[PDB]
């Protein structure tokens, strides 16, 4: 016992890969890679796939809970917001790979206390004019939940108090101003 | 609920 068992995760997590193609729809460009529910199977999948910095510009990694797809159209992704992290050109070297890995550990470790059930997933956008890392929640009306997630999210990544990270609902994103900032 | 620390998750890379 406890010698041969894999350390199990709270939730089952599905990893998605998005690659832009003007010839088809946006939903068809988002494709699934695998699923896992243990700490061992997370490292097995992560250690053989590419780093976010090495990805070709225009591609997204998307980790979400099993049952939620990486799109605003999902039930849990409806209404719910986004804690958005903008990264500049030079940040590509070390900050992108380190912030995204730190984001993954906050998801699967469920370190957000009781407000981890509100957390839907995360997405990193490898873009040529910027890079974007985000955490998705299930409801933007829960100010008690949203503020606590983003505050622990900023402490875990270790940003200086000078930089203020923004939270915006997908209703504003799909049509921008922040609802909460830390 | 199962909670894992950042220190514990790093040690499982091997
Ligand atoms: C996550 N997402 C971004 N888009 C569109 O991507 C377009 C540009 N590419 C992106 C954003 O903007 C993102 O965030 C992202 O990725 C935007 O105009 C969004 O409308 C989307 N469209 C559908 N139908 N479903 C999505 O889940 C979606």
Author numbering:
A (entry chain A): 31 to 205, 211 to 217
B (entry chain B): 51 to 64
Pull verbatim passages from the article behind this deposition.
Squaric acid possesses similar charge distribution, polarity, and acidic properties as phosphoric acid, hence the squaramide group could represent an isostere for the phosphate group. Despite low overall resolution, the eIF4E co-crystal structure with ligand 4a clearly shows that the squaramide moiety acts as a phosphate mimic by making a similar interaction with R157 despite an altered conformation. The positively charged N7-methyl guanine system forms the characteristic cation-π interaction as expected. Surprisingly, in the context of the squaramide phosphomimetic group, the expected enhancement of affinity upon replacing the N7-methyl group (4a) with a benzyl group (4b) was not observed. Crystal structures of sulfonamide 7a and squaramides 4a and 4f in complex with eIF4E were obtained and show similar binding modes to cap derivatives co-crystallised with eIF4E previously.
Initially, the 40S ribosomal subunit associates with Met-tRNAi and a group of initiation factors, including eIF1, eIF1A, eIF2, eIF3, and eIF5 to form the 43S pre-initiation complex. This complex is then recruited to the 5′-end of capped mRNA by another complex of factors (known as eIF4F) consisting of eIF4E, eIF4G, and eIF4A. eIF4E is an indispensable element for cap-dependent translation initiation and plays a major role in recognition of the mRNA cap structure (m7GpppN, where N is any nucleotide). Under resting conditions, eIF4E is kept in an inactive form bound to 4E-binding proteins (4E-BPs); once the latter have been phosphorylated through the PI3K-AKT-mTOR signalling pathway, eIF4E is released and can associate with eIF4G to launch translation. eIF4E is overexpressed in numerous human tumours, and it contributes to transformation, tumourigenesis, and progression of cancers. eIF4E overexpression facilitates translation of weak and highly structured mRNAs that typically encode proteins involved in cancer pathology, such as proto-oncoproteins (e.g. cyclin D1, ornithine decarboxylase), angiogenesis factors (e.g. FGF-2, VEGF), and factors related to tumour invasiveness, such as MMP-9, due to the ability of eIF4E to stimulate eIF4A. All complex structures showed the characteristic cupped hand structure of eIF4E with the ligands occupying the cap-binding site.
